[PDB]
Amino acid sequence: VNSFSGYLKLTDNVYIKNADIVEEAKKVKPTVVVNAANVYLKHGGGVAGALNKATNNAMQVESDDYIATNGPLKVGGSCVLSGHNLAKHCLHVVGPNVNKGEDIQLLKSAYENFNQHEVLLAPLLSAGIFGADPIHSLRVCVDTVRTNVYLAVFDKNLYDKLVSSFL
Numbered sequence: 079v080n081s082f083s084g085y086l087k088l089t090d091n092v093y094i095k096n097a098d099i100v101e102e103a104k105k106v107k108p109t110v111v112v113n114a115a116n117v118y119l120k121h122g123g124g125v126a127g128a129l130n131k132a133t134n135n136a137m138q139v140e141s142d143d144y145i146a147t148n149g150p151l152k153v154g155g156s157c158v159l160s161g162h163n164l165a166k167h168c169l170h171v172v173g174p175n176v177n178k179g180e181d182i183q184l185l186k187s188a189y190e191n192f193n194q195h196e197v198l199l200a201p202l203l204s205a206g207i208f209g210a211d212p213i214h215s216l217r218v219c220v221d222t223v224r225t226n227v228y229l230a231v232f233d234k235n236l237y238d239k240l241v242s243s244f245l
């Protein structure tokens with residue numbers, strides 16, 4: 079049993095809810111919240127901008143030190159950093175950004191990072207301002223992630239479309 083509430087069950091291990099991931103993280107304090115990161119960990123907008131704002135920019139400060147030491151992530155890659163006031167840990171995962179021309183096949187590699195964590199609160203990778211089709215992102219998620227993933231979808235209209243079209 080875990081503390082996630084109000085989710086629709088899509089499969090054995092994937093659950094979904096119309097929710098603001100920031101508010102959901104603040105209430106659950108999950109072990110892992112996933113950020114929709116870019117390779118530079120520049121958390122300017124979308125999910126990343128919202129998560130970072132909720133940490134009062136502490137996420138960005140920590141991220142800048144990480145990049146100064148380690149250099150950029152790979153598209154499809156990830157790193158584990160602090161969850162600050164939102165979670166124990168934040169898994170920063172880089173989905174391909176279609177608006178940068180990045181190969182959508184890397185979306186599966188991005189979701190594979192979730193398998194290193196038994197339970198996660200996450201957004202749909204490469205959705206929103208990353209330009210991919212969220213229906214496709216949900217399909218890749220379901221077909222790739224084997225650990226228990228709680229997906230937060232901010233837009234109610236999109237949430238309803240994702241549920242109604244799910245196979």
Ligand SMILES: O=C(O)c1csc(CCNC(=O)c2cc3nc[nH]c3cc2F)n1
Binds near residue numbers: 201
């Ligand atoms: O419906 C979805 O989940 C969806 C559609 S596009 C996309 C990526 C961009 N997300 C955001 O800008 C975003 C900003 C927030 N500010 C406060 N809480 C937020 C949650 C967010 F998700 N997510």
